[PDB]
Each structure stands twice: as structure tokens, then as C-alpha cells.
Design a binder for this molecule. Sequence first.
Ligand SMILES: CO/N=C(\C(=O)N[C@@H]1C(=O)N2C(C(=O)O)=C(COC(C)=O)CS[C@H]12)c1csc(N)n1
Length: 262
Amino acid sequence: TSAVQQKLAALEKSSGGRLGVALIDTADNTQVLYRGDERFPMCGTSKVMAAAAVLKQSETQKQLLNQPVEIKPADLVNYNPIAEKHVNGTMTLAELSAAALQYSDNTAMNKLIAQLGGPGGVTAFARAIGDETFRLDRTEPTLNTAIPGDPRDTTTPRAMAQTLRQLTLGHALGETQRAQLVTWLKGNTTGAASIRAGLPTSWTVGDKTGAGDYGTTNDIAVIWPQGRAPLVLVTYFTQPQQNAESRADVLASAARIIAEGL
Ligand SMILES: CO/N=C(\C(=O)N[C@@H]1C(=O)N2C(C(=O)O)=C(COC(C)=O)CS[C@H]12)c1csc(N)n1
């Protein structure tokens, strides 16, 4: 183990939970992993895969993002900050993607999942871009149950870091679609206390958070440091008590550790 991994282990010990980290440094294509091949509940970080899958569809259906989708009262779930403003109205697939990614709207995520034919359609897209680990099994809100040991709606930090790299810096998506995803991630509103809080303020960051039961608190980010090659960082955290409070500070701390030297 390296000093980085040792610091992450110490953070984990003090936190009382289980911490998973994967950093990809595109400068030399190296990876730093902590519990990198253990499965963790994704919660809302899975919204990146769903939005990306719809972007992929739009590469051959060029008007798809503009397609209005009906929002019915019965569609609302447990957290619908944007969709609730469109009950008995519509949101386009672009608007649903922005809401799911930038506000972590759960109704918006369910519409993306439906557009893909269900959770299996999101998983199928993951497989198509070379992610053999990701699995989406449920819709919102049950995909965030985060039960210890439950393989449903999980991935590993290594796999999610590799996929996030391919989606944003690589070419799993077409050029316009890649840029659109990056724009959405950069404009996220929910990440100020997570990875962003542990990085220098001059660094540009795009991220997607997630949260669930068992105090599950997650963040995945693409990072552009000042005058250096970009990084991808996944920080997953989950706890023993079903009713544990969120711990965004732990993600900020992991980011602070990872940033040393970069
Ligand atoms: C059964 O589902 N339980 C959830 C849940 O809906 N998580 C989802 C997820 O991931 N989300 C994020 C997210 O991206 O972190 C926030 C972010 O919240 C805010 C106010 O920005 C809004 S809720 C949504 C849950 C358990 S604890 C918590 N906050 N949510």
C-alpha cells in the first residue's frame, strides 16, 4: 500500500463506515484505488449512466433530446424538485437529463429509465461501452436502499471511474454528446459539500452525488486542475446503521487526501 491508501484507511477507520475510492490520473494513466474492486450502492451516481444512455440514443435520433415527455401526478416519487413544477405538463429528455443530473431529481431519473426500456436498458448501455460491472436493477426510489451485501444497483469504484473517464474525457459518446454531459456535470447544484469541498477552488469540477439508506453518501467527479492533465475521482461511502446520517465531509476528506501532490 502507498501513503495515499494508508491515509484513506485512516479516514475510513475514523468514519466508522466503509469507504471506496478510485482516482484515475490521465497524465500517466495511473490509478489509485481503495476498496477499488468492492461493490458499493451507487444511489444517484447511477443517474450519469442513464443520462449518458439517452445521449447515446440521440446520436442516431438527432431530435430526441427535444422530445417532450408527460409528467403525471402518479409519476412523482420521494424527491422531485424540478418535476413537481411540471405535473400535468411535460419535460423534454434534455430537461429530464439536466434535472436528474443537476438537481438529482428522482422523477426525472425514472423518466430516463423508462425511455431506455427499464433498468436493464441502462445496464445494457453500460455493457455496450465496456463497463462489465455496473448494474441497475430498480427504479427510484428503491434503487437507493443500499442494503449491506445486496448486489442490486451497485458497481465498484474502479469500474465507475473508468466509465466516467470514457464518458467525459474519452469517446464512449459522440463529440456533441460528450460535451453536453460535461456541461451538465459542471453545472451540478448538489455537490458543494462533497468532492468539491476538498479540492482547490481554482480547479474546475463536474460531479454527480448520490445518497441513500445506511448513511450512504457518494460522489463521482471529473476534475481539471490548474495547468495539469485531468483526473477522474469516485468516492463511495456507506455505514452500518440503516438510519445513519449522511457524511459528505468524509467525501471531502477523501478528496483532500487524493489532491495532495496533484
Ligand atoms: C430511497 O431513497 N433515498 C434517498 C434518495 O432519494 N437519494 C437520491 C440520491 O441518490 N439523491 C441525492 C444526491 O444526489 O445526493 C439528493 C441530494 O439531496 C440534496 C438536497 O441535494 C436528493 S435525493 C436523491 C436518500 C436517502 S438520504 C438522501 N439525501 N436521499
